[PDB]
Structure formats: structure tokens, C-alpha cells
Paper text:
For lipidic cubic phase (LCP) crystallization, an initial GnRH1R construct was generated by replacing the third intracellular loop (ICL3; amino acids [aa] 243–256) with the thermostable Pyrococcus abysi glycogen synthase (PGS) domain22. To further improve the homogeneity of the receptor, the point mutation P1283.39K (Ballesteros–Weinstein numbering used in superscript) was incorporated into the engineered construct and the position 3.39 mutants were previously shown to make receptors stable in an inactive state, and were also reported in other recently elucidated GPCR structures. Finally, GnRH1R (P1283.39K)-PGS was crystallized using the LCP method in the presence of elagolix and the structure was successfully determined at 2.8 Å resolution. The overall architecture of full-length GnRH1R consists of seven canonical transmembrane (TM) helices but lacks a cytoplasmic C-terminal helix (helix 8). In summary, the GnRH1R crystallized in complex with the antagonist drug elagolix represents an inactive conformation with respect to G protein coupling. In contrast to the previously reported structures of β-branch class A GPCRs, one interesting feature of GnRH1R on the extracellular side is that the N-terminal region (aa 18–33) before TM1 is well folded and inserted into the orthosteric binding cavity with clear electron density in the structure. The overall pocket in GnRH1R is defined by the N terminus, TM2, TM3, TM5, TM6, and TM7, forming a highly hydrophobic binding site. The pyrimidine ring, as the core of the ligand elagolix, sits above the aromatic side chain of Y2836.51 and forms a hydrophobic π–π interaction with each other. However, the oxygen atom at position 4 is engaged in binding with the side chains of residues K1213.32 and D982.61, forming only a polar interaction network in the elagolix binding site.
The central regulator of the HPG axis is gonadotrophin-releasing hormone (GnRH), a decapeptide neurohormone produced by mammalian hypothalamus neurons. The GnRH peptide can activate the GnRH receptor through the heterotrimeric Gq protein pathway. There are two isoforms of the GnRH peptide in humans, GnRH-I and GnRH-II, and their effects are exerted by activation of the classical GnRH1 receptor (GnRH1R), which belongs to the rhodopsin G protein-coupled receptor (GPCR) family. GnRH1R is expressed primarily on pituitary gonadotrope cells but also on lymphocytes and breast, ovary, and prostate cells, and has emerged as a promising therapeutic target for the treatment of conditions including infertility, uterine fibroids, endometriosis, and prostate cancer.
Numbering used by the authors: 18 to 65, 74 to 144, 152 to 183, 192 to 242, 1001 to 1196, 257 to 328
The structure:
Amino acid sequence: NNSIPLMQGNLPTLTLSGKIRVTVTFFLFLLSATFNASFLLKLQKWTQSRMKLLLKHLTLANLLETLIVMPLDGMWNITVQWYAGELLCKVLSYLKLFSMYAKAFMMVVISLDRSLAITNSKVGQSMVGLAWILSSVFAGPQLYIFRMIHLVFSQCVTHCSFSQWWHQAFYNFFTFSCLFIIPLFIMLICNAKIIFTLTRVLGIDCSFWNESYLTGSRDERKKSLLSKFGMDEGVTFMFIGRFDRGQKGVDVLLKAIEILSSKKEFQEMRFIIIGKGDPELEGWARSLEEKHGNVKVITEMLSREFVRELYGSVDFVIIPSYFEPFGLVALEAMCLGAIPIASAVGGLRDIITNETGILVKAGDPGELANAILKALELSRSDLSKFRENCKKRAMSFSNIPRARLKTLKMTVAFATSFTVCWTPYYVLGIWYWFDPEMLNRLSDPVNHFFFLFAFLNPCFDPLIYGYFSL
Ligand SMILES: COc1cccc(-c2c(C)n(Cc3c(F)cccc3C(F)(F)F)c(=O)n(C[C@H](NCCCC(=O)O)c3ccccc3)c2=O)c1F
Ligand SMILES: CCCCCCCCCCCC(=O)OC[C@H](O)CO
């Protein structure tokens, strides 16, 4: 009853505009074929690494899915009758699923290898072998379950092949998951990690944010700055952010300061808080600026050159944020030698280790107060190895080899192309599965369009490599 026309078209006859549309499909077939062909040749002529090893097998599955499904579904078997024989109906139904299982499992193997590469052997080729293995084993049943029926005219269908209704439901469910949904799952997850890396890497201009441009010794830099402002020398914490309520944490710091205000070791501490935003939060800071001469507040925005000034002079960066999935202030800061004190709320949770700063629970004014107190209790011993750890840790987060970087940006493009182009094709597939009478509500122009939109992905893959090839 509720099956899927995987090898059967839905046009009683061929309209003139149908013959126009098949010619237009022939175009996209030709763009795809000659391009993945000319990209395959580029690869062997460039063989006379592993990221090349995987692009060959992806492009090989691209060519294979283009040569099999574009003529089958787009040019030939588009009417409701099967014009070949029973043998070519079981072989072609096999090759159709085989070439699509293979294209997906290649995007899975690349998304998996590159997600690992952000942390030259045999494992490289055992992945793509498994990909061709699974995709050939998963398409096996299509040889037995498809048959040519002539009850009139002939068609290549699964009718009267499964017994119970559950035998067929689980088969088509298995086809959908292992064709699109499960790969999309594995892909989106692996490419989510690569997105975090790229954001950090392409987000720190290390050619600017580095300590080679500073002048002289670090404590000279601090004396000179602390009297530039107009306070005397002491342990220095700094905050630079938008004055926000429930967002960046300036209220937490301010209340933490007022806890630390009438205290025992408050006299040794300097605080430079910087930022503009809501107005009631500035009057709080600026009132602590008149009650205490070791609290400077700067709401005028500064120069790019003067932020690097401070990161490599202050003793600590207080980063009391509520939500910070990337953490670039902490990486600029650490790149210049400053020690971070931040709330474990995202990238700060991942960026600050045990020997690279002090993490605290977010949103608590106290506890931050005790962190600021722990930080000063460990300043009596001169922290030089402590600052080199942040310099090197933040260095790695912000820096990536050029070569491994283009393949990183490449993989994210491959995935987005697959996610974008194949999602409309396959949801109408699952939509049809739940309600077959949905087909009676869709154009021939839009059925044709979402067919072409899907095969934009495999013929633009070669374009994605070439683009990120400088
Ligand atoms: C496990 O399920 C699977 C597995 C693999 C592929 C398909 C698969 C998908 C996802 N779509 C997308 C699609 C629809 F489903 C329904 C409406 C519109 C579209 C559109 F996006 F194209 F607009 C296809 O069109 N075909 C083409 C398929 N006819 C095969 C013969 C060629 C033709 O029909 O001319 C078909 C047509 C209409 C309904 C169901 C199947 C597919 O085989 C599939 F359903
Ligand atoms: C847009 C269609 C496909 C998109 C694939 C995105 C993969 C999902 C991971 C999202 C991670 C994220 O933080 O997204 C934010 C990104 O900076 C958007 O500009």
C-alpha cells in the first residue's frame, strides 16, 4: 500500500515541456560529468597525501552517482512504464542505491578524518574501503526485492515482494537514515567542531596580537601604565566588555569588587574596567571610582593599539561572562601574557586549563571574589612560567598550518553543499512516505527544480576544491 516509487516515474505521457526539461537535465548531467572527470585527472597527474586520497574517492562517488541516477531518474525512466527488462531493473535499482550510499559515506569519511585532524598511513584507505564496502552491502537487497510486474503495461516495483507491512516499513526507514539522516547527523557534529576551530584560528590576527611589539620589561610596562592612569603599583586585574545586565558580567565583577571592597587585601589590588553600554551600570562603576582610588573606569572607547597595551601589562583578565562559545578576548589576552579569570561558560571552559588560568562558576559575585583573592595569593611568587603557558596554549588555539587550513575550510563547504542541496530532495521523500497524495500537489517545474538543485551539489564539489586552492 504505502511504498516508494524508487524505480518508477509519475508521468503518463511525455509533454513537450517535458522534453524541454529532459534536455535541460542533460545540461546539468554534462556539467557534472566532465567536471568530476577533469578533477579526477588533476588528481592522478598530481600523483604522477591523505586529503588528496579522500578527494579522489569522493569525486569517484560523485561521477558514479552522476552517471547512474541523472540519466535514470531524469532522462529515461521518467514515465510510468518500464521500457527495459527484469534484469536491467534489478541491476539499475542496485546501482541507483549503491551510488547514493557511496556519495554519503564519502562525506562521512571526510568529515570524520578532518574532525580528527584539528587535534600518512593505512587507516586512511581502510576508511574509504569500509565506505565502498558498506555502500555495496547496504544496496544488496535491491537485487532481490525489486521485480518487473505487468499488472496494461510493465513496471519495475517492489509490489508483492515484501510479506508483512512491517517488512517494508523498516526497509524504507533503513534506506532513508543510512542515505541522508544519519550521515547528516555525523556530518553536522564533526563540522560543528571544525567551525569552532576556524572561528578561533581566523579570528586572532596574531600578526597584530603578539608581544613582540611591546616595549621593555613587563613590570616596567605595568608601573608606566598604572601611573599613566594615576594609581600606584599593585596587582592589576582588567575587564573590557559591554556594560550589560545578564550577558557579559560587569555586574558580577562590580558586586564582586564591592564584596572585596571593605576587605583585608583590597589595598594591593588595581582594577581597570573598560566598556560602554547600559547607563545604570556605569554609575555603579563610576561611583566605585570616587569611593576607591584603585578602581579606574573607562567608557570612552580606546585604540586597537592600546588594548594590546593593556593585555600585556595587567596581571589578570577578569572575563565574568554568562555566554561565550568562542572566547577571543581570552585568546588575545593570553597571547600577550595576561592571566585569565573567567567563568566556565563555553569556549572559556575549553580554552583555560589548570596551568593556564582560574575558572569559576558563572553568575556568582562571590566565588569570583575568592578567585580574585586566590589570584593575588599566588602573585607573591613571580609568575613567569604561568604566563608562558597561556602564551603557548592560546598560540595553538589561534594558529593553524596554512595547508591543513584550506582543507578545513574545504570540508565545511562540502558539508554545507550536501546539507543544503540534498535536504529538500529527501524531505519530500519522507513527506511522500507519510502521505503519498502529496505528489498531486506539486508542479512539474518544482519537481524538476528540486531534482536539479540536488545535483548541483556533486557538480560543485570540484568547484569547492578549486576555490580554496588559492
Ligand atoms: C527511500 O526513499 C528514497 C531513496 C532515494 C531516492 C528517493 C527519491 C526522492 C527523495 N525523490 C525526491 C522527490 C520525492 F520523493 C517526491 C516528490 C518530489 C521529489 C523531488 F525532490 F524530486 F522534487 C525523487 O524524486 N525520487 C525519484 C522517484 N522516481 C524514480 C523514477 C524517476 C522519476 O520519478 O521521474 C520518486 C518520485 C516521486 C516520489 C518518490 C520517488 C526518488 O527516487 C527516495 F524517495
Ligand atoms: C546553513 C545550512 C547548513 C549549515 C551547517 C552548519 C553546521 C551546524 C553547526 C552550527 C555551529 C554554529 O555555531 O553556527 C554558527 C555559525 O557561525 C553560523 O554563521
